[model samples]
Target chain A: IDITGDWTVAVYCAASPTHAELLELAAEVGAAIAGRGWTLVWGGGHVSAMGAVASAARACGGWTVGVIPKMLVYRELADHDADELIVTDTMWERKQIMEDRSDAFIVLPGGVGTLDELFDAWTDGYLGTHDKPIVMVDPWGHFDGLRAWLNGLLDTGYVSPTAMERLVVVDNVKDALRACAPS
Target chain B: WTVAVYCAASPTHAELLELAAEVGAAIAGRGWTLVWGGGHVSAMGAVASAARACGGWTVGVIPKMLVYRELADHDADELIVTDTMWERKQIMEDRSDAFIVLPGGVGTLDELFDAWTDGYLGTHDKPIVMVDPWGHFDGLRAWLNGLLDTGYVSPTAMERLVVVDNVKDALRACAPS
Candidate 1:
């Protein structure tokens, strides 16, 4: 997990029944991010929401990597199918690996676990732990409510406007990539 | 004839099941083989059980990473495994006569963009149609056009893509009958 960089994007995707439009949007975003030559990172799962983001980045010929917890790997649920699979010992390690490797993060729609990843990134950002961009692909207004809640934090001065600026809400991939562009 | 459709494997939408059934039946009736993202193609169990009536030649190009449980029936006529999900798209492109992109996810978009670039480069002029039902594709066209307008892609290159509003229009764009 190398954090010293210009822009390395870590993308998260939602799994099945996640609508074609949303998936397409994420893929386009992944491609745009990869096109900018960013390091794409995410959880290493072989099916559903897990594989979509990694698959998109790889398809676009980007430098993509997958990190799976050793427990999940031992359970054989991880995507054994990834090109570069990193085996970590625990969930904390898995998130740490992603946080360490990426300078920015984008989250797509997913289940409770996916939501967990989003909160972790949000908390890390809110705490001023990093200066990275955190973009949420809010297709069909998925993150509209969530964004409002985050804004609540800002309104209370729990988070600064400058800190909030680090949070980008984009509907499409192109916007996500542009948000991630070197500033 | 064989056309690979890149679409979402998610079953979250009520409309998607109907759409898949319609497309599967259409493919079967026309005797056109169907290849799709993992969990599609009856190569897996869920689709096989759900789409047992499609009867079309089905294939699933599964990514090496996600080849977990045998939950997908694997009853398809064929299945090809790849190192990564991206390779799945490449394998499909290599074997497909043409590409018809359904409303899909990041993987689908990536594949469509690759085909878009290939068509733009004249790598292979096979018809590529971005078909959406329920008017889902309209905004995506605008987004792509924005890219073109911004010079991320050229107008002529963008012209190479065929955006169809429905499946009927999509097939017509590919093969005028």
Candidate 2:
């Protein structure tokens, strides 16, 4: 996504969710970011939700940047058409670059990799590595299990107040984008 | 061979405390070295203390900043301090042969993810065991299936993880054949 808004939004969602609703949500978020005139940074694959977002953004003339590791290029179908495609040697470097390049992280429902990405961002934020906000988009209560798990951590005091305050969870992309905006 | 235990540094419940203690005792009873986040407070403290009581060698590694925050365990047989949290994590990984993830929060999750990622990437073949005696990771397990079904988490990574329901099973997984 191109950036007249001067924001680089990093979106993390399922790369292979065949569910139409999830893919629809991904495209909606992608088009919205493009419509906002912001740059979109992502895992840089044109498959499932990952590809849907990039395609939707480009359809709206938004510049898209895809950051991928060498190992995942063929596995994730590296988006050759991304406005800017950056390749790293490892997943660690890819994630580091994605974090450094983005203004905020917008998380959607996904699996293992998604959880790792979300946790890594929150861990860094709580640790004061950076102040960037993490916007978790959970519309259908899909992440209820995750919330309950975190609540357990919080109740037991493993999750401090500072750690609790590091995340912004919303049920809609509208609020997610709103929270992603720098105050 | 050192066993790295990643747990919380905050207040903990009884079942967890007992479990940690048992795990620690088992580790020490075997005369294996225990390397951890270095806090002698609530979480890893239970394990380390139990291990020490059972005559196990305990290594505590933490960042200088987190010493006061986590109420550092300077009484360990060996306490190695680092400048950054990242460095501490690296040192813990470098110093250990296997990993046991205890019930905890983001900090533990952060370390567990790094350990698991390294396992998934084939960067290390060490057995990464997640101990969920209370089934606290049900949500995580449910979410993992989502990825596992679609092949996002390949068999190579799947085989590296030893998900055990009991702390004893976790210890069993980390034991050398």
Candidate 3:
């Protein structure tokens, strides 16, 4: 499961309701990654969060990769002109492609699909299917309740105590390393 | 012009998770590069989603200290582990033309202040923006204003830290004057 060196880190973000600063963060990450000569990946939309991060990374001299289900590629306003628009046969296949290519995962505050991806990783971590570290960015305590609720599950034994321990929750970008990285 | 953002790597609530993705994607659409912080799964997953839409490049930079957590998504266009946050910042700053601040905790605030200070000192003249969609930066604003009132920071310094109500305005504010 250690794809860190094989693929550039991919981003999972929402398509709308994005704020500019968040977009800028996406760009900085893109630039940082690209500047180091790593690839950037995302969903196949040209507007909103995904597009913003990808464009910025490219602007800063990096490459980009995209994954789109065949059903969604033409149906949705996908960036067909992209260098790589991986068109899978099904939604499941799309997820599998993402799983296959990614070395790590970063979940931005996004929509239902975003939640789907986040929870999928959570289940993987819980079931021991994958032990990759999971970090959730909580700006302004936005994730405060969810963290507490998950802790509740751990306390009640509904979720393993280890599940709670698996999470690297932090309030800022700097602490991201602490939760995901070791001391 | 280019704007860079840094936010919390973890979410405290389920609702904000969606917000983060939406924010990430929207930022991508505006043709801005996104450099988010997370370890293996969270950060890589985000980059994957954005890569699906963008024609450009996406990236993930792990600190040498955090490499053990790397997961399976290595086929990315770019992936590298840095020595530390300072080095990571240097890479980001060297590439970016501007800066943006989003909803985040201490880490996001740290990056915001770092860039803001850099702008004020003329280390960089790029636009620095702070978006308060949920009034997230209100407290920080008050604190910054207090510093200005006490003459600890100049009014021109405060001017470098742009604040706005939404993403569109933030981008506009961060662009060249």
Best by TM-score: 2
lDDT of 2 by residue, A36-91 (tens): 88889999988877888889999998989999877677565899999999998866
- Across B120-170, the per-residue lDDT of candidate 3 in tens digits comes to 545667877766566655544664464355333456766766677676676
Q: Estimate each model's TM-score.
A: 0.49, 0.86, 0.45
Clashes of each: 19, 3, 115
lDDT digits (tens) for residues B105-147 of candidate 2 = 8988888877877677556788899988777777777766655
The full ranking of all candidates by DockQ, starting with the best, is: 2, 3, 1
Supply candidate 2's per-residue lDDT for B45.
88
**What value does DockQ give for candidate 3?**
0.02
TM-score, structure 1 vs. true: 0.49
lDDT of 1 at A82: 70
Poorly placed runs, candidate 2 (over 4 Å): A1-5, A74-76, B53-55, B68-70, B76-86, B142-160
Model 3 segments more than 4 A misplaced: A1-7, A174-183, B1-177
True contacts kept of 3: 0.00
Per-residue lDDT of candidate 1, residues B61-125 (tens digit): 87644456443436657877766533565678777776776654333445666566456545577
Q: Which scores higher on TM-score, 1 or 3? A: 1
Best-to-worst ranking by lDDT: 2, 1, 3
